[PDB]
Amino acid sequence: SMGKTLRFEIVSGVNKGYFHTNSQSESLDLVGGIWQKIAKEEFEKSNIYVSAVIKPSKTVYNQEWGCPENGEETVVLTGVANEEFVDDIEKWKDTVIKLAKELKNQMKQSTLTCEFIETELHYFK
Amino acid sequence: SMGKTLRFEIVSGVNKGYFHTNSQSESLDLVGGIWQKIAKEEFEKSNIYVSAVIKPSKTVYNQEWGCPENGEETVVLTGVANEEFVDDIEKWKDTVIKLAKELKNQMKQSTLTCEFIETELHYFK
Amino acid sequence: SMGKTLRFEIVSGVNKGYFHTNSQSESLDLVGGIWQKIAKEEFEKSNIYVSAVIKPSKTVYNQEWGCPENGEETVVLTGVANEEFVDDIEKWKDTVIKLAKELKNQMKQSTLTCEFIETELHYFK
């Protein structure tokens, strides 16, 4: 049940220009599919499968720097290191960083953020 | 205004098989209604009412373990302990855990996660 | 790349009564537009531009205190202090608090919460 651990949160654009998607639902499928693919690959190499909860969102920033009025379509990916499956937090933390950089590449992103946050996880099973 | 406290985050499936829901909006109403019900019950017993902000999402994991392509419908519930209403963080923390386990039961979930995160809350009123 | 910093999270209502909005998409545009406006103003005074990732949500609380069945439309705004643009975490933290109070005023909110959370940011560029 109880355990002090890490959660991650990744924010990424959806590059509608490159992928030609027109709805948020399409962008969520795009990013979900890409994550499913690269997490699987990395799982078959390290036996660490990093799941992700993904939410659609909009990022609001300066219109002078090219943000559309009221914000730009983005996706947020979150996940947590469950010590029932994760034996080393550092190996997991390095795997997340690896997947973050690969997601940035697959999504053709100029920038991407990956945060880690200390969290106390309760897992009911 | 300022105060160092706890926030919780709960991730749960929506069990479309059990409840026969076909849209995300239906799943959000389902989980919102259940939470409204059990938080009320627990409030009438402990005088602690735990509110929750709920967001629809998708959880992406291995397709070999039964995840649909691009992810499975989930809901995220978040909330924070406001010291203007919460006199003991530990009683609140135990009440959240109680509601988490009850939500897992009402949602017929095999598993469920409940995290607590240290946060500095500013409450403007 | 690596850096220990702060993230913020703001939860706000959308006051459909005041603004006469009928869809979530309308409420997201409303809040996105307001944030874009006040962050720009504050940027031109302090040279700190605070971006925000915004998500629609519902807040579930007691129906006796006026919450609709299954929850009330809300918006969640999140952001992070990137030390590549933020030279003083305290000036940034004060600017977020400033924008939070201004957003509360522009949204005609009785209450509003603003949380800060310690986070380790990895910025890929």
Question: Which string of DSSP letters, residue by residue, matches A59-123?
Answer: EE--GGGTPPTT-EEEEEEEEE--TTT-S-HHHHHHHHHHHHHHHHHHTT-S-EEEEEEEEEEEE
Percent composition of chain B: helix, strand, coil (DSSP 3-state, to 5) = 40, 35, 25
User: Please, what is the end-to-end C-alpha distance for chain A in angstroms?
Assistant: 8
Chain A residues with CB under 8 Å of C32 CB are: 58, 60, 70-71
Element (H, E) at A32: helix A24-46
Query: Is the Cβ pair A62, C43 closer than 8 Å?
Result: yes
Q: How far apart are CA C119 and CA C96, in angstroms?
A: 16
Question: Closest approach of chain B CAs to the CA of A25, in angstroms?
Answer: 11
Give Dmax (Cα) for chain C.
50
Query: Is the Cβ pair A74, C52 closer than 8 Å?
Result: no
Q: Which chain A residue has its CA at the smallest distance from B100's CA?
A: A124
Q: Do B82 and C74 meet the contact criterion of CB atoms below 8 Å apart?
A: no
Which has the closest alpha carbon to B103: B91, B111, B94, B115? B111
Q: Does A51 touch chain C (CB under 8 A)?
A: no
Q: How far apart are CA B34 and CA B20, in angstroms?
A: 15
Q: How far apart are CA A73 and CA C23, in angstroms?
A: 18
Alpha-carbon distances of B95 from A28, B49, B98, C65, C82, rounded to whole Å: 34, 9, 5, 20, 35
Chain A residues with CB under 8 Å of B115 CB are: 7, 80, 119-122
Alpha-carbon distances of C7 from B10, B12, B35, rounded to whole Å: 19, 24, 27
Which has the closest alpha carbon to C36: C90, C88, C91, C79? C79
Domain C2-122 fold is Alpha-Beta Plaits (3.30.70)
Resolution, in Å, please? 2.2
Token pair 């009911």: residue: A124
Q: Do C32 and A58 meet the contact criterion of CB atoms below 8 Å apart?
A: yes
Query: Is the Cβ pair A121, B111 closer than 8 Å?
Result: no
Count Cα neighbours of B76 within 13 Å in the Cβ-side half-sphere.
23
B76 in helix, strand or coil? Answer: strand
The pair of structure tokens assigned to C70 is 């299954």
According to DSSP, residue C119 is labeled E
Helices (H) and strands (E) in chain B, counts: 3, 4
Q: How far apart are CA C39 and CA C12, in angstroms?
A: 16
Q: How far apart are CA C3 and CA C14, in angstroms?
A: 34
Angle of the A24-46 helix axis to the A89-106 helix axis, nearest 10: 130
Q: How far apart are CA B49 and CA B39, in angstroms?
A: 6
Question: Closest approach of chain C CAs to the CA of A73, in angstroms?
Answer: 10
Chain B residues with CB under 8 Å of A54 CB are: 57-60, 71
Angle at B122 between CA B118 and CA B123, to 5 degrees: 125
Q: How far apart are CA C105 and CA C110, in angstroms?
A: 9
Q: At a CB cut-off of 8 Å and minimum separation 6, what does B87 contact?
A: none
Chain A residues with CB under 8 Å of B58 CB are: 28, 32, 53-54
Q: What is the DSSP string of C13-58?
A: E--HHHH---SHHHHHHHHHHHHHHHHHHHHHHHS----EEEEEEE
Element (H, E) at B43: helix B24-46
Beta pairing partners, C9: C78, C115
Q: How far apart are CA A38 and CA B11, in angstroms?
A: 23
Q: Does A7 touch chain B (CB under 8 A)?
A: yes
The pair of structure tokens assigned to B52 is 């929750």
Count Cα neighbours of C54 within 13 Å in the Cβ-side half-sphere.
27
Partner-chain residue, chosen from C35, C36, C119, that has the shortest CB–CB distance to A117: C119
Q: At a CB cut-off of 8 Å and minimum separation 6, what does C99 contact?
A: C35, C38, C39, C42, C50
B87 in helix, strand or coil? Answer: coil
Q: Do C96 and C104 meet the contact criterion of CB atoms below 8 Å apart?
A: no
Beta pairing partners, B38: none
